[PDB]
Amino acid sequence: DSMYGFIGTDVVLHCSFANPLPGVKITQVTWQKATNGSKQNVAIYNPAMGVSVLAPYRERVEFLRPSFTDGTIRLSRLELEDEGVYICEFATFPAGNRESQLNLTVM
């Protein structure tokens, strides 16, 4: 998936989970950026304990509605450095980690 955003602006990134079969529990959603060689996590949601947003995104990233039927966050005030692959990782049971990906372009 490819998304486009403008600097200073905001983009809404979506979590593209397909069809969650019977009977997988979806436990968790983690947003991740591929940078430098691996991932680091951007934000995590879990109905169990709620929402956590990680540095350096602590003031730019926020969940919209917290859910897996969504998985949708908001990036604010875009920056050249934000361009790249964003992974949406889902902790499912008993299937394990399931992920999706999107490329962001900042213009």
Partner: protein, 233 residues
């Protein structure tokens, strides 16, 4: 596969006292070697008593009603360490076996490895299910009770030649082992949930690794032979 219930009751959180990964470079470490695989689709048992129950006996000796603790695993490269695992405990009962704690964090994993690695029932050892050859290397475990650290290094060897035909090798191509950190970086503070991600406790973690394994014709061994202070073959 039913979703396992917790074992014992405990309040589960993402964090307790620690927000940064504790350094593994915290002293010398006793060396153990995992026993060789019969066939490359088998299970490797990073298992070795850290004799942590002494520290539990002293807590009963000095009459401390609870101990705190944390466990972490690392992959040691050259002057630097990759993250693999972290979990923290609070208000544990010294009279019970290790891990019986009223407050614990969700384990924090490096997810590519979580796909085929998972903790043992005692929470002090690791199991490496059907590993690709890239998993060769030095694994360090940190056990800490009331601020006192026990380090163990596990050297993992696997046959040259045969690599298991269904080993998880995809994520590794893309992300590998993750960032390599030096004691300096650890001191500065490597955020736990930035580079590690919250996962399932040992029982449900086991059922997922088991479900994948089965789906590949194999089944988890009933028992595992511990690691030795010496090399074999």
């Amino acid at each position: 596969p039913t979703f396992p219930p917790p074992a014992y009751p405990y309040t589960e959180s993402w964090q307790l006292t620690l927000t940064t990964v504790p350094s593994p470079f915290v002293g010398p470490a006793d060396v153990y070697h995992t026993r060789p695989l019969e066939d490359p689709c088998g299970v490797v048992a990073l298992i070795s008593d850290p004799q942590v129950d002494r520290l539990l006996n002293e807590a009963v000796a000095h009459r401390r009603p609870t101990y705190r603790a944390h466990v972490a695993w690392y992959r040691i490269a050259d002057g630097c360490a990759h993250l693999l695992y972290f979990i923290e405990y609070a208000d544990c009962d010294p009279r019970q076996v290790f891990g019986r704690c009223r407050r614990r964090t969700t384990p924090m994993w490096w997810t590519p490895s979580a796909d085929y690695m998972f903790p043992t029932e005692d929470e002090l050892g690791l199991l490496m299910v059907a590993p690709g050859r890239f998993n060769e290397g030095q694994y360090r475990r940190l056990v800490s009770v009331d601020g006192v650290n026990i380090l163990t290094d596990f050297m993992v060897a696997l046959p040259e030649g045969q690599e298991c035909p269904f080993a998880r090798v995809d994520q590794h191509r893309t992300y590998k082992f993750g960032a390599c950190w030096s004691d300096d970086s650890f001191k500065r503070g490597v955020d736990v949930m930035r580079f590690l991600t919250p996962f399932y406790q040992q029982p449900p973690h086991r059922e997922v690794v088991n479900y994948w394994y089965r789906k590949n014709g194999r089944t988890l061994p009933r028992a595992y032979a511990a690691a030795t202070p010496y090399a074999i073959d």
